[PDB]
Amino acid sequence: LTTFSLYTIIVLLVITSLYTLTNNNNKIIGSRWLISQEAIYDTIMNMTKGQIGGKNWGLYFPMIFTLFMFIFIANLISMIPYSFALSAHLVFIISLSIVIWLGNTILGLYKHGWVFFSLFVPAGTPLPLVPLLVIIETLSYFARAISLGLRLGSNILAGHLLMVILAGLTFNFMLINLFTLVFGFVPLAMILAIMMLEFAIGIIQGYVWAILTASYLKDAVYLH
Amino acid sequence: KLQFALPHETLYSEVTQVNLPAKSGRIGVLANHVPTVEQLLPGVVEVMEGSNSKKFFISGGFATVQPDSQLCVTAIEAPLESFSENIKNLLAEAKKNVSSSREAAEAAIQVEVLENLQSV
Amino acid sequence: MLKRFPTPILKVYWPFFVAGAAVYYGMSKAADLSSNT
Amino acid sequence: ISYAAYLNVAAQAIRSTELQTASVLNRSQTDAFYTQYKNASEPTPITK
Amino acid sequence: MPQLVPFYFMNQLTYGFLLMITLLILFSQFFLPMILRLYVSRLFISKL
Amino acid sequence: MQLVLAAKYIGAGISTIGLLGAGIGIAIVFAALINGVSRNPSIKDTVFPMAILGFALSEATGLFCLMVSFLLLFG
Amino acid sequence: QLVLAAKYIGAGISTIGLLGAGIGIAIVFAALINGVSRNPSIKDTVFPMAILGFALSEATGLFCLMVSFLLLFG
Amino acid sequence: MQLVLAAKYIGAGISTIGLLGAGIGIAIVFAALINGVSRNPSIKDTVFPMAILGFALSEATGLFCLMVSFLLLFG
Amino acid sequence: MQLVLAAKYIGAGISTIGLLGAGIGIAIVFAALINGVSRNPSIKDTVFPMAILGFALSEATGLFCLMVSFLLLFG
Amino acid sequence: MQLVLAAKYIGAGISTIGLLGAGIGIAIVFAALINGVSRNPSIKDTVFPMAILGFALSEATGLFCLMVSFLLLFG
Amino acid sequence: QLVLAAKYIGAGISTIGLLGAGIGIAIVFAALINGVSRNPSIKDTVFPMAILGFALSEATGLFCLMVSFLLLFG
Amino acid sequence: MQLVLAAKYIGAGISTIGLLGAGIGIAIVFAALINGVSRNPSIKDTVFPMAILGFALSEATGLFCLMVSFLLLFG
Amino acid sequence: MQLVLAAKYIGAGISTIGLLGAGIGIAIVFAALINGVSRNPSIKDTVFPMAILGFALSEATGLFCLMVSFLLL
Amino acid sequence: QLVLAAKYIGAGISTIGLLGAGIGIAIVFAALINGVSRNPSIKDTVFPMAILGFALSEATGLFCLMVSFLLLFG
Amino acid sequence: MQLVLAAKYIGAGISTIGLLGAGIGIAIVFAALINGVSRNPSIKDTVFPMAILGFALSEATGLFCLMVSFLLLFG
């Protein structure tokens, strides 16, 4: 197989365990871990009940949730001191973003006809600049395709690259004269802080994806 | 401390925790605060003695911190009783009241008061 | 507990699925083009 | 609208969520007239 | 960049889209409804 | 040839400067949210869509810029 | 050779122009949030205008990007 | 040839920087429009056409700059 | 010479940078106009002539930068 | 090649510049936090998560600049 | 001919100095409109003060322009 | 030879500019602290930890920039 | 000759950038004068000296830059 | 020779960094004056805070300066 | 030779850029002074030694820029 293939299997087995081997018996009172997956479920439920809130409020709740969860798990596994790439393999993230974007454009055309193009006049403006407001609304509409993907990919990748390059240098930092072994703890503390940050902005990205790909769909479903 | 008042009756309680709805949004006053004169909007008012908080419906008035931490509040009639849907039905009557233009402002106040109940 | 509870997310997510297939083919050509010298 | 009328109207409105006391109702309903006078000459005593 | 040295982009992406389809069905039919069982049961207990 | 490769790697560096502006843009929108909330603690739900919208739109110009850097390096 | 280098350099510098638009957009959206927090109620009139202000801010940055592409492709 | 063509290209890249200021200008006008209208509720009937004028004047500086960029490259 | 002609094209590009300050500047005057007018409801009869004045000189500083761009470009 | 090696170290430095915007960005969000909390005495419970969000996103844009810096610097 | 080339380059760089005055001129007049709208009546006295500041802000950019000319003529 | 050594000394210089941004950010947080504490003289004890956090984070973005300067200088 | 003479002219051009700040500086003080005066009304006779002082110091920065330009020429 | 030219240039570049600190120091002090004028009496608590904020702003200019010196000499 | 002399004149120029920020800083302290004194009518006596301290510190930064310009100018 491929290292990537082995890690896709690992992601699947982790996600299964969050609903089979962390929930004891479907207990009414619930596990201390399971309080989290109630809260996450509810805060994205009540968010897509808010955001979409139609007769399809929650028909896009599985899609917005598996876009949360993919990014949420694959930016923890890749942050471990030894680990390869999942979301740091950009081709899965960029492709997934473009796929969702195409699946919005096609959905909008299918569901809302050629009055899909009423999306690209989102506001009544004076008539000689009505065509202008189609050009740079549709331009801004397929900017959503790459904005969404490139944000996540760059963050995760930049984190791994920062940590590893600095780690190799700080090994050799201790190998200068003995005065560096006095305050030999200080570069270790810097790498620890960077590693902590690299977990944080990735969990932020899983949520930011799932709100942003509610917003683009909000624009597309509810014309204008 | 506070000086919260009402026409027949006055209740107010060192300035260390009052949360006030004021022209500048909502303002919290704790002990010494800079000396201000701010009109209290039609309001939901919280007065905290300690951090224990008692919650008031207030018809708006005026607030004036005197620099000595004396929060002079003068306000009219009041709350959890007054909040407790006929005012909402009255707001719908205020929708028919918008057909008359002071009356527009009155109906607007009714919408504001309904909003204030929703705030409760 | 887990159980299959049907979700008719078929035509709902029909435009999403079509895009995945197209990209699957196109990335085959892109990957093959990159695997050359 | 004038601010103290605005606050007043709010007090009157407050006599409607629901639930109330007599003192409120008296304090908000007690309206009368007001003899519009003029420089001797006196226009009508239109509502307070 | 240590990840453009691969030309295994399609291999990777193939395993990627397979994981997505697997999880989507799995959540939607199994695990999301297993949370909805907890919720409905909690409301029924609240009722009785 | 050396000139071409030199210029390629330099050109990547130059484009990267554009990102700083968009980053400031995001921060400003979240600061605005904070000010709105403190001034009316019930404004928040109406404001929340507009805030996320402004963050994204600010960010987008910078991400166009980042693609030029990558076009220069890889292309 | 020198022509190839020149388009790469020129492309970099032109790309920097996008920076101003990112700030511009945020000033409009900030003013929107501030305006709506000021009024509680301005948004209906203001919201079309706010999307316009954003659009115009974006458009200038897009001119900057377009010069970069006119160099590189052209 | 390569140097002259380069000098055009370099000049074009540099010229594009100027466009940013007029752009920021448009945002400032629209921000003020929002702020003013939120303050007054009703200034808008004068202020909306006034705002379009303000946009045009701030923008114009950018357009002069853009003209020069096209003159260097195409002209 | 080639070198001198190169410097004309490159130098023209640099000149265009000067305009940006005027672009932001003009907008600041219009922001103040709208702010002032929303504050007063009625300041405008005196103030609109003032706003045109502030625009004009702010623009002129930009125009000085612009003419140097043309001068270098043409030679 | 001496030119190319010089190009690597230079291009790195240029990319580093992008970080500055994020640094200011962090502060702007935190300044808003401080102002709001002072107003209410009590907005802080809600506002502290919002403050962290504004910082994190602004920081991310900066980090993209840092990663180009390290790609050129090291590589 | 490098020196002649250099005169033309130096002129270009000089334009950057003017920009600061361009923002500045507007800031003084902005303040004028804000102050005047707050006060009404301050204006007749304030107008001599305003003109002084306006001119002063301009002059710094003017110095930058003069240096452009000094380079050009030699 | 000369090109590579030169690049270290130049490149270090270029990096140093970025650090200025972090400096400005720290000041913005402190400004907010002073104004905030003035407006409610009881907010100080809550706000002073928050202020130090905003300083620390703002400084850090500058620090990463400055690290690249010394890395170019001595690598 | 050529490189050095060229360099003198270039260095001078770069120097103009320092002056811009003084221009902005002066503007900030005068903006403040008007803001202050609009805030107090009657502060002006005392405040006008303060405004002039802040102006002078801001301007002075531009003057120093100008003199460096003259040296390079 | 080229290396000696490069030393002097490298130093120059670093000097630009000082500008941020110059603005910065002022911003802290501006808040001090506003805070003091607002409270009449916040000064004694605020003064160590103000000194700290100043110090950090100035320091950023100094660090920039120290890279200049390293480059100036070598 | 030519390069070193060139570098000295250039290096002086680059350093001159540093001064601008200090200039703007001095203005900012004075702006606060005017606003405070106009606000209070009478804060001035307490404020004057503090204000002078802030001005001086802001000014000093620009002075540092100037001496590096001379060091490079003279070489």
PDB file of all heavy atoms in Angstrom, chain K residues 31-70, unseen atoms left out:
ATOM      1  N   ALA K  31     -10.572  67.181  10.258  1.00  0.00           N
ATOM      2  CA  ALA K  31     -10.699  67.662  11.606  1.00  0.00           C
ATOM      3  C   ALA K  31     -11.521  68.906  11.643  1.00  0.00           C
ATOM      4  O   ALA K  31     -12.372  69.055  12.515  1.00  0.00           O
ATOM      5  N   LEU K  32     -11.313  69.800  10.642  1.00  0.00           N
ATOM      6  CA  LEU K  32     -12.074  71.011  10.455  1.00  0.00           C
ATOM      7  C   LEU K  32     -13.539  70.705  10.335  1.00  0.00           C
ATOM      8  O   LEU K  32     -14.336  71.287  11.058  1.00  0.00           O
ATOM      9  N   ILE K  33     -13.929  69.749   9.462  1.00  0.00           N
ATOM     10  CA  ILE K  33     -15.319  69.417   9.237  1.00  0.00           C
ATOM     11  C   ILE K  33     -15.969  68.782  10.453  1.00  0.00           C
ATOM     12  O   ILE K  33     -17.114  69.097  10.770  1.00  0.00           O
ATOM     13  N   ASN K  34     -15.241  67.903  11.181  1.00  0.00           N
ATOM     14  CA  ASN K  34     -15.704  67.250  12.394  1.00  0.00           C
ATOM     15  C   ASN K  34     -15.978  68.237  13.502  1.00  0.00           C
ATOM     16  O   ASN K  34     -17.027  68.210  14.145  1.00  0.00           O
ATOM     17  N   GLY K  35     -15.019  69.165  13.718  1.00  0.00           N
ATOM     18  CA  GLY K  35     -15.070  70.164  14.754  1.00  0.00           C
ATOM     19  C   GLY K  35     -16.203  71.115  14.521  1.00  0.00           C
ATOM     20  O   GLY K  35     -16.998  71.375  15.416  1.00  0.00           O
ATOM     21  N   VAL K  36     -16.304  71.621  13.269  1.00  0.00           N
ATOM     22  CA  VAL K  36     -17.290  72.563  12.785  1.00  0.00           C
ATOM     23  C   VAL K  36     -18.687  72.000  12.868  1.00  0.00           C
ATOM     24  O   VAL K  36     -19.619  72.725  13.190  1.00  0.00           O
ATOM     25  N   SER K  37     -18.877  70.694  12.576  1.00  0.00           N
ATOM     26  CA  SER K  37     -20.168  70.044  12.644  1.00  0.00           C
ATOM     27  C   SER K  37     -20.622  69.854  14.065  1.00  0.00           C
ATOM     28  O   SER K  37     -21.819  69.871  14.342  1.00  0.00           O
ATOM     29  N   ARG K  38     -19.660  69.661  14.995  1.00  0.00           N
ATOM     30  CA  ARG K  38     -19.938  69.548  16.402  1.00  0.00           C
ATOM     31  C   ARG K  38     -20.348  70.902  16.953  1.00  0.00           C
ATOM     32  O   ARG K  38     -21.349  70.997  17.658  1.00  0.00           O
ATOM     33  N   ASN K  39     -19.563  71.969  16.669  1.00  0.00           N
ATOM     34  CA  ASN K  39     -19.765  73.313  17.182  1.00  0.00           C
ATOM     35  C   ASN K  39     -20.823  74.166  16.510  1.00  0.00           C
ATOM     36  O   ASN K  39     -21.313  75.076  17.174  1.00  0.00           O
ATOM     37  N   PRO K  40     -21.127  73.983  15.227  1.00  0.00           N
ATOM     38  CA  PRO K  40     -21.427  75.110  14.349  1.00  0.00           C
ATOM     39  C   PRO K  40     -20.502  76.311  14.283  1.00  0.00           C
ATOM     40  O   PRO K  40     -19.804  76.461  13.282  1.00  0.00           O
ATOM     41  N   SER K  41     -20.581  77.223  15.279  1.00  0.00           N
ATOM     42  CA  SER K  41     -20.164  78.605  15.184  1.00  0.00           C
ATOM     43  C   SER K  41     -18.680  78.875  15.235  1.00  0.00           C
ATOM     44  O   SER K  41     -18.261  79.989  14.924  1.00  0.00           O
ATOM     45  N   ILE K  42     -17.850  77.885  15.643  1.00  0.00           N
ATOM     46  CA  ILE K  42     -16.410  78.010  15.817  1.00  0.00           C
ATOM     47  C   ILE K  42     -15.685  78.465  14.549  1.00  0.00           C
ATOM     48  O   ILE K  42     -14.605  79.050  14.599  1.00  0.00           O
ATOM     49  N   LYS K  43     -16.307  78.198  13.383  1.00  0.00           N
ATOM     50  CA  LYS K  43     -15.751  78.196  12.059  1.00  0.00           C
ATOM     51  C   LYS K  43     -15.007  79.415  11.582  1.00  0.00           C
ATOM     52  O   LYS K  43     -13.994  79.278  10.907  1.00  0.00           O
ATOM     53  N   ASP K  44     -15.483  80.640  11.891  1.00  0.00           N
ATOM     54  CA  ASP K  44     -14.887  81.834  11.324  1.00  0.00           C
ATOM     55  C   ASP K  44     -13.513  82.130  11.875  1.00  0.00           C
ATOM     56  O   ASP K  44     -12.644  82.606  11.147  1.00  0.00           O
ATOM     57  N   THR K  45     -13.309  81.856  13.186  1.00  0.00           N
ATOM     58  CA  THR K  45     -12.045  81.960  13.881  1.00  0.00           C
ATOM     59  C   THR K  45     -11.136  80.844  13.477  1.00  0.00           C
ATOM     60  O   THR K  45      -9.945  81.043  13.246  1.00  0.00           O
ATOM     61  N   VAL K  46     -11.710  79.626  13.404  1.00  0.00           N
ATOM     62  CA  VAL K  46     -11.005  78.396  13.174  1.00  0.00           C
ATOM     63  C   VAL K  46     -10.490  78.366  11.768  1.00  0.00           C
ATOM     64  O   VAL K  46      -9.465  77.744  11.526  1.00  0.00           O
ATOM     65  N   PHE K  47     -11.174  79.018  10.798  1.00  0.00           N
ATOM     66  CA  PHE K  47     -10.775  78.973   9.411  1.00  0.00           C
ATOM     67  C   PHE K  47      -9.373  79.530   9.185  1.00  0.00           C
ATOM     68  O   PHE K  47      -8.617  78.826   8.519  1.00  0.00           O
ATOM     69  N   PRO K  48      -8.898  80.646   9.735  1.00  0.00           N
ATOM     70  CA  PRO K  48      -7.485  80.995   9.683  1.00  0.00           C
ATOM     71  C   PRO K  48      -6.523  79.954  10.238  1.00  0.00           C
ATOM     72  O   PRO K  48      -5.487  79.730   9.611  1.00  0.00           O
ATOM     73  N   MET K  49      -6.848  79.300  11.386  1.00  0.00           N
ATOM     74  CA  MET K  49      -6.030  78.252  11.969  1.00  0.00           C
ATOM     75  C   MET K  49      -5.894  77.049  11.074  1.00  0.00           C
ATOM     76  O   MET K  49      -4.813  76.479  10.935  1.00  0.00           O
ATOM     77  N   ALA K  50      -7.028  76.628  10.470  1.00  0.00           N
ATOM     78  CA  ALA K  50      -7.152  75.490   9.594  1.00  0.00           C
ATOM     79  C   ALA K  50      -6.295  75.632   8.372  1.00  0.00           C
ATOM     80  O   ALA K  50      -5.583  74.700   8.004  1.00  0.00           O
ATOM     81  N   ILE K  51      -6.320  76.834   7.745  1.00  0.00           N
ATOM     82  CA  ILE K  51      -5.552  77.160   6.564  1.00  0.00           C
ATOM     83  C   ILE K  51      -4.071  77.102   6.854  1.00  0.00           C
ATOM     84  O   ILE K  51      -3.296  76.618   6.026  1.00  0.00           O
ATOM     85  N   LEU K  52      -3.645  77.560   8.059  1.00  0.00           N
ATOM     86  CA  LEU K  52      -2.260  77.484   8.473  1.00  0.00           C
ATOM     87  C   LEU K  52      -1.765  76.053   8.529  1.00  0.00           C
ATOM     88  O   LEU K  52      -0.729  75.737   7.950  1.00  0.00           O
ATOM     89  N   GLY K  53      -2.525  75.140   9.179  1.00  0.00           N
ATOM     90  CA  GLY K  53      -2.158  73.744   9.310  1.00  0.00           C
ATOM     91  C   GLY K  53      -2.110  72.994   8.006  1.00  0.00           C
ATOM     92  O   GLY K  53      -1.239  72.153   7.794  1.00  0.00           O
ATOM     93  N   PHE K  54      -3.088  73.278   7.121  1.00  0.00           N
ATOM     94  CA  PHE K  54      -3.261  72.740   5.792  1.00  0.00           C
ATOM     95  C   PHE K  54      -2.044  72.985   4.930  1.00  0.00           C
ATOM     96  O   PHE K  54      -1.466  72.053   4.367  1.00  0.00           O
ATOM     97  N   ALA K  55      -1.577  74.257   4.922  1.00  0.00           N
ATOM     98  CA  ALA K  55      -0.404  74.708   4.208  1.00  0.00           C
ATOM     99  C   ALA K  55       0.856  74.045   4.709  1.00  0.00           C
ATOM    100  O   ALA K  55       1.723  73.644   3.931  1.00  0.00           O
ATOM    101  N   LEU K  56       0.966  73.913   6.050  1.00  0.00           N
ATOM    102  CA  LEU K  56       2.122  73.371   6.722  1.00  0.00           C
ATOM    103  C   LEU K  56       2.298  71.913   6.412  1.00  0.00           C
ATOM    104  O   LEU K  56       3.415  71.472   6.150  1.00  0.00           O
ATOM    105  N   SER K  57       1.194  71.133   6.418  1.00  0.00           N
ATOM    106  CA  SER K  57       1.211  69.724   6.098  1.00  0.00           C
ATOM    107  C   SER K  57       1.688  69.490   4.672  1.00  0.00           C
ATOM    108  O   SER K  57       2.510  68.604   4.444  1.00  0.00           O
ATOM    109  N   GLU K  58       1.210  70.322   3.705  1.00  0.00           N
ATOM    110  CA  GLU K  58       1.617  70.319   2.306  1.00  0.00           C
ATOM    111  C   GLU K  58       3.105  70.528   2.060  1.00  0.00           C
ATOM    112  O   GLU K  58       3.706  69.900   1.182  1.00  0.00           O
ATOM    113  N   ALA K  59       3.720  71.474   2.810  1.00  0.00           N
ATOM    114  CA  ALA K  59       5.093  71.905   2.619  1.00  0.00           C
ATOM    115  C   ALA K  59       6.145  70.818   2.730  1.00  0.00           C
ATOM    116  O   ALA K  59       7.173  70.881   2.059  1.00  0.00           O
ATOM    117  N   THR K  60       5.947  69.816   3.612  1.00  0.00           N
ATOM    118  CA  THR K  60       6.881  68.724   3.801  1.00  0.00           C
ATOM    119  C   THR K  60       7.029  67.880   2.544  1.00  0.00           C
ATOM    120  O   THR K  60       8.140  67.575   2.110  1.00  0.00           O
ATOM    121  N   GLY K  61       5.885  67.581   1.881  1.00  0.00           N
ATOM    122  CA  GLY K  61       5.815  66.901   0.605  1.00  0.00           C
ATOM    123  C   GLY K  61       6.436  67.732  -0.484  1.00  0.00           C
ATOM    124  O   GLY K  61       7.103  67.213  -1.375  1.00  0.00           O
ATOM    125  N   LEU K  62       6.249  69.075  -0.415  1.00  0.00           N
ATOM    126  CA  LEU K  62       6.816  70.025  -1.354  1.00  0.00           C
ATOM    127  C   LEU K  62       8.331  69.969  -1.366  1.00  0.00           C
ATOM    128  O   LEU K  62       8.950  70.025  -2.428  1.00  0.00           O
ATOM    129  N   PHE K  63       8.964  69.821  -0.175  1.00  0.00           N
ATOM    130  CA  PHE K  63      10.398  69.652  -0.024  1.00  0.00           C
ATOM    131  C   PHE K  63      10.879  68.433  -0.779  1.00  0.00           C
ATOM    132  O   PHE K  63      11.877  68.495  -1.495  1.00  0.00           O
ATOM    133  N   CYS K  64      10.131  67.306  -0.680  1.00  0.00           N
ATOM    134  CA  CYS K  64      10.431  66.071  -1.384  1.00  0.00           C
ATOM    135  C   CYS K  64      10.410  66.265  -2.891  1.00  0.00           C
ATOM    136  O   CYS K  64      11.251  65.722  -3.604  1.00  0.00           O
ATOM    137  N   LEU K  65       9.442  67.076  -3.390  1.00  0.00           N
ATOM    138  CA  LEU K  65       9.283  67.414  -4.791  1.00  0.00           C
ATOM    139  C   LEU K  65      10.444  68.235  -5.297  1.00  0.00           C
ATOM    140  O   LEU K  65      10.954  68.002  -6.391  1.00  0.00           O
ATOM    141  N   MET K  66      10.928  69.183  -4.463  1.00  0.00           N
ATOM    142  CA  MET K  66      12.041  70.048  -4.776  1.00  0.00           C
ATOM    143  C   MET K  66      13.301  69.244  -4.979  1.00  0.00           C
ATOM    144  O   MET K  66      14.066  69.521  -5.895  1.00  0.00           O
ATOM    145  N   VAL K  67      13.516  68.198  -4.143  1.00  0.00           N
ATOM    146  CA  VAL K  67      14.638  67.285  -4.239  1.00  0.00           C
ATOM    147  C   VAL K  67      14.614  66.487  -5.523  1.00  0.00           C
ATOM    148  O   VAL K  67      15.666  66.218  -6.100  1.00  0.00           O
ATOM    149  N   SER K  68      13.404  66.130  -6.031  1.00  0.00           N
ATOM    150  CA  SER K  68      13.214  65.465  -7.305  1.00  0.00           C
ATOM    151  C   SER K  68      13.757  66.333  -8.411  1.00  0.00           C
ATOM    152  O   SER K  68      14.500  65.863  -9.269  1.00  0.00           O
ATOM    153  N   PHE K  69      13.413  67.645  -8.372  1.00  0.00           N
ATOM    154  CA  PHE K  69      13.854  68.621  -9.341  1.00  0.00           C
ATOM    155  C   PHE K  69      15.343  68.838  -9.262  1.00  0.00           C
ATOM    156  O   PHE K  69      15.998  68.923 -10.297  1.00  0.00           O
ATOM    157  N   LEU K  70      15.922  68.875  -8.034  1.00  0.00           N
ATOM    158  CA  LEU K  70      17.345  69.029  -7.816  1.00  0.00           C
ATOM    159  C   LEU K  70      18.126  67.899  -8.431  1.00  0.00           C
ATOM    160  O   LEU K  70      19.160  68.137  -9.047  1.00  0.00           O
TER     161      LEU K  70
END
